[PDB]
Each structure stands twice: as structure tokens, then as C-alpha cells.
Write a protein that binds this ligand. Structure first.
Ligand code: CTN
Ligand code: NAG
Length: 246
């Protein structure tokens, strides 16, 4: 398991949590020095438990699929909550079984569906450590519309930060003041599968992408990523989605 406490949190403690999260994901090899997530894990070992504590010390446990860093569901007191999707239903066979009741959320976990449920795109939803405190608090008691927004915050401040050093740093800058994600942040989130694929394909193609990946940079300008020498590959991305799962 991994844990993060918002009470007393600062950029350093958040950084330690994201390091722990990354290190909790298993891999047998690295591709261009980046951990390659496994094609498959069997049984309960497929799921990592994240214990998150709001400023008041109340807690939820979030279940994360270790092959893709997808959030499956979470436990709040004696109630479990899972996304309305087959992968999450499968997860419910293994985690939070001791919960008194299980609620299936009225949406799947993908960004497009969560934004519809929340009533806004995540371009307009502030993120940061304060927002994460709010998200945890919202998830403690069921409210599906509120939870969609909370989950958009949760996914970005945990999973996406684990995937990209740039996103981790963006949240560290928002340790005491929320701000909507940069255009680059959104770009990286949307390109993780594509980037993971091209980096794996680059092995066997002299480090060259079979298909270029278009990203927005820290400046708001649209760059094109063609090979493993790019900063996105050498410094930014921290985990690769296995091509088996793409
Ligand atoms: N069950 C799920 C499904 C998806 N996701 C996140 O949303 C993105 C897909 O739009 C994915 O890239 C992933 O980050 C999630 O957190 N949990
Ligand atoms: C590889 O990517 C770098 C950085 O984006 C770029 O400068 C260079 O032109 C690319 N090299 C090749 C051979 O495409």
C-alpha cells in the first residue's frame, strides 16, 4: 500500500508520495530507462491500495490497477464505490470485499464520461493539493455529480502525476493554491497511451517513433515528438503502458 496525508503536506511530502506510488507499480524491464508496466497481473495483486487522508484526518482507500494506473474504485468508511465498467467490476471481486455495501457509480472512469457527469471539462476544474483535500472530503459521502469532479481531481493529482514528472511538478506548484491544469498537462494526459506505444515501437526502429506524437509545450505552443531524444522521453514520462494493453 501507499499513503498520503494532506495535513502538513508540502511539495516535499507530495513528491515522496508520488515516488512511493511509482515504486509500488511492478515491472520486469525498462524501455529507454523507463519502467514498462506489465501486460497482466493475476488476482488481488493487480490492485494497489492508496490511503488518502484529508486535512481533518478522514480517509478513503483508492484501488489502482497496476498495469495501467487506472483508478477502479474506492472505499469510504463502510461503503465501496466502483466505476461502471468491466475492469472495475472485476476489481470489485478482489478489493473492499468487507464493505457493508457496494455502489456502482453512474459513469465509467474515462475522462470524457467524467466530464459529462461533472458538467465541465477538466480545463475548467482547478487542481492542486487543496483541491485534492476537497476531493477526498467529497468522496466520503455519496454524491455522484460532485464525485465526478472529485474523481477528475483525484486521477490527475495521483495517476497522472505518477506518469509524468511535469504533472507532479505542476501539482507541487499548486501545494497551497489551486489552478486549472496547463494546456501541456492536458496534452500529456491525453497522449500517455500514444507516447507509451511509440517509445516501445522505437525499440526496433533506432529510437525513432513509427508515428509522431503532437504535444502542447510549457509555453502553450504545439510541438511534435519524433524520437526518444526528446525531453518528454528522457525526462518527463515515468511509466509506460504496455503495448499489449493498447
Ligand atoms: N477506470 C478508469 C478509466 C480511466 N481513467 C483515466 O481516464 C483516462 C481515459 O480518459 C485514462 O488515461 C486514465 O488516466 C481512470 O483513472 N480510471
Ligand atoms: C529527434 O527529436 C529531437 C527533439 O525533438 C529533434 O531535435 C530531432 O530532429 C529528432 N531526430 C530525428 C532524427 O528525427
Amino acid at each position: 500500500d501507499v499513503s498520503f496525508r494532506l495535513s502538513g503536506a508540502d511539495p516535499s511530502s507530495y513528491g515522496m508520495f508520488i515516488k512511493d506510488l511509482r515504486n509500488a507499480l511492478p515491472h520486469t524491464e525498462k524501455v529507454y530507462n523507463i519502467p514498462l508496466l506489465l501486460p497482466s497481473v493475476s488476482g488481488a495483486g493487480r490492485y494497489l491500495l492508496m490511503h488518502l487522508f484529508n486535512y481533518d484526518g478522514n480517509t478513503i482507500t483508492v484501488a489502482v490497477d497496476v498495469t495501467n494506473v487506472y483508478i477502479m474504485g474506492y472505499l469510504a468508511l463502510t461503503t465501496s464505490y466502483f466505476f461502471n465498467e468491466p475492469a472495475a467490476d472485476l476489481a470489485s471481486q478482489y478489493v473492499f470485499r468487507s464493505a457493508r455495501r457496494k455502489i456502482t457509480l453512474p459513469y465509467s472512469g474515462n475522462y470524457e464520461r467524467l466530464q459529462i457527469a461533472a458538467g465541465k471539462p477538466r480545463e475548467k476544474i482547478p487542481i492542486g493539493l487543496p483541491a485534492l483535500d476537497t476531493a477526498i472530503s467529497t468522496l466520503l459521502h455519496y454524491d455522484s455529480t460532485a464525485a465526478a469532479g472529485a474523481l477528475l481531481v483525484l486521477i490527475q493529482t495521483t495517476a497522472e502525476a505518477a506518469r509524468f514528472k511535469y504533472i507532479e511538478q505542476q501539482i507541487q506548484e499548486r501545494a497551497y493554491r489551486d489552478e486549472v491544469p496547463s494546456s501541456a498537462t492536458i496534452s500529456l494526459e491525453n497522449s500517455w497511451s500514444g507516447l507509451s506505444k511509440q517509445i516501445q515501437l522505437a525499440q526496433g526502429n533506432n529510437g525513432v517513433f513509427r508515428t509522431p506524437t503532437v504535444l502542447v509545450d510549457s509555453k502553450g505552443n504545439r510541438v511534435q515528438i519524433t524520437n526518444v531524444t526528446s525531453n518528454v522521453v528522457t525526462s518527463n514520462i515515468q511509466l509506460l503502458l504496455n503495448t499489449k494493453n493498447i
